A paper describes a structure:
Here, we have used x-ray crystallography to determine the structure of a complex between CTX and the paddle chimera, a mutant of the Kv1.2 K+ channel from rat brain, with particular focus on the influence of toxin on the selectivity filter structure and distribution of ions in the pore. Charybdotoxin (CTX), a pore-blocking toxin for K+ channels, is a 37-residue peptide isolated from the venom of the scorpion Leiurus quinquestriatus. The architecture of the paddle chimera channel typifies the family of eukaryotic Kv channels such as Shaker, with four pore domains together forming the ion-conduction pathway through the membrane and four voltage sensor domains surrounding the pore. Scorpion toxins have evolved to fit like a lock and key into the pore entryway of potassium channels, and disrupt ion conduction through presentation of a lysine amino group that competes with potassium in the selectivity filter.
A CTX complex with the paddle chimera channel in the presence of Cs+ shows that toxin is bound but that Cs+ adopts its expected distribution (i.e., similar to its distribution in KcsA in the absence of toxin) with an ion at S1. It is difficult to tell where in the electron density map the amino group of Lys27 resides, but it is clear that Cs+ competes effectively for site S1, despite the presence of CTX. The mechanism of competition put forth above predicts that CTX should not bind with high affinity in the presence of Cs+. As shown, this prediction holds: CTX inhibits with a nearly 10-fold reduced affinity in the presence of Cs+ compared to K+.
Author numbering:
A (entry chain B), C (entry chain B): 325 to 410
B (entry chain B): 32 to 417
D (entry chain B): 68 to 153
E (entry chain B): 32 to 67
Amino acid sequence: GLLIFFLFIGVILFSSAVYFAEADERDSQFPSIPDAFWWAVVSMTTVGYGDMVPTTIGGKIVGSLCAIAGVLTIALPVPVIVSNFN
Amino acid sequence: SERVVINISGLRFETQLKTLAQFPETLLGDPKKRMRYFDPLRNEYFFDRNRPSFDAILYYYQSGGRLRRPVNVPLDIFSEEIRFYELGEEAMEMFREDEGYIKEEERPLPENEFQRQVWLLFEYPESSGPARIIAIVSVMVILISIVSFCLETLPIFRDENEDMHGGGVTFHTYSQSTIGYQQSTSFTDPFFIVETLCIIWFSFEFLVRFFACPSKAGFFTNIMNIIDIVAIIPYYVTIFLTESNKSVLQFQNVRRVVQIFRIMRILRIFKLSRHSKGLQILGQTLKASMRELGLLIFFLFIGVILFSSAVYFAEADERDSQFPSIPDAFWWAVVSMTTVGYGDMVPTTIGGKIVGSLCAIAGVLTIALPVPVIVSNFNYFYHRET
Amino acid sequence: GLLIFFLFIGVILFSSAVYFAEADERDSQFPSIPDAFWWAVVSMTTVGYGDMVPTTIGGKIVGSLCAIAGVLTIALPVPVIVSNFN
Amino acid sequence: YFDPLRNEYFFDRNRPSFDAILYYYQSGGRLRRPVNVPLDIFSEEIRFYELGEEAMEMFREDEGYIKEEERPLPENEFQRQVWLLF
Amino acid sequence: SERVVINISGLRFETQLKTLAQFPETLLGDPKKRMR
Ligand SMILES: [Cs+]
Ligand SMILES: [Cs+]
Ligand SMILES: [Cs+]
Ligand SMILES: [Cs+]
């Protein structure tokens, strides 16, 4: 559950920031904050399909932090789960 | 039930004489052997030795066989004690098994004089300067046979043919495609040359090994020898097939097979496992991780089907659905689960994207499970090198 | 070194198989075996750029195994390195 | 087990285990297995000193183990007969 | 082989004098040093 919750907190944060950082664009790939949820989950789990990508310096900065925070978030609850498994 | 007192550097131990008498061939069980350590003034046997070890030695008599090393006692010390108290080899062996160790083999070429002489240059690089040169030369040949096999596909070398622009697919132009090189006792083709020099060497190694072989009994048992054989089977089987089918219409009837054996040449990369410890370690790791490795594929399978199904239905009522059928979505599911996510297939509907999120997360967890074990088995074999 | 070596062994294997499995195609994204090296390293490290992707059932089967073998290969030498670090 | 010459009880048994057996009396119930003593050995001692099943059970719980169930088809003759193939 | 008894806060240790004499410069190996 903590895994889903943390992912949730991250999605909203990064979806919001990316949205605003790409807002003043005629070709913004992020129509709304809820639209950016897909991109955020995709880059956090790092599955990164590339079907939505920031284009502005700001968006790309937000994206970098989203990529890094994603890797750490997942890496936390897993070790335990993995244990219970063994 | 006469009692017996054993004093180990001041630490007092007592037991019954019948307890020690249980093992007549040991030091404490032999009256003539312990006699030397008896102190008639204190009515006890005294040994100026290691204290932590003795609880275990004594328990070995009391338990009737159990010889465990105390958790807090180094293995080098405890084995020295086992020897001193002369518990015997049968017990030390079983002790060493439970402690981890266990193994031993070899045996140079039985007599032979010359057999056992050659079998030291193609089997033991750790013997002489020359024998170590063979390894160097053998590796080169392998790396080369690999680079060769690879260039044979480079269009820069195969687009320089008779029908490069599309105008008359010749027979010896068609068979050179299916093979990668032009076979001919004229040795015109550079590739057919190198590929031939390499098979000569690989054919040499195999024969030499098979003759200077000590136990030709289990030669085709050693997985390493199986590789040496498969590394050359394509070459000769191809010749056989191109000669048995020397006409356009017949070679076309056996082209499939020919192609298969061309693919089988890649297995020559595994010929490096003879000069690579790590490659050998990995092999052992895989043989030891059969169940987890399988569980990994099974779990991935269960996940693929589930997520392929859900994504399919969630993207079904779409004119531009990237998922034609459930089996088509298998690719997407494996791609997103292993998280390699190529993006060549992506959901577009809220539902599909929800399914995709769960597929991404479930993928990360699934993989992360069996790995830890595999990784372990690896470290076990990797470190248990010395 | 073992990390680079194992990656090397994997690249060649999967580059070869993918090549042949996508050979009889007019739109094969794999011109030669050496060309497929890029795809193999890209999918094994799982960075998977999607700039080269198999299209035939066979190619996709090879790709699945390449993705899985990649994840395991990397995961081996790392633990040690990570240790030396700590 | 009494030795009238030395006014003591003598047991030709395992040494590391006894601290625990004795402490069980002193503490009034606590039966812990010494960290350095194998579980197979310690349980044999628990049985020898006849600490009783109520204590062994609680000991085994804290040690990890715990479980047990089943029961074939009650009579049935044929019920309990089929319930062995499915 | 004169024996030597060493008492460490009540824990009893015994060894042979030649065992300690093996290292003459240590406390237990020096008669003048352990005397105390
Ligand atoms: Cs990716
Ligand atoms: Cs991508
Ligand atoms: Cs990872
Ligand atoms: Cs990834």
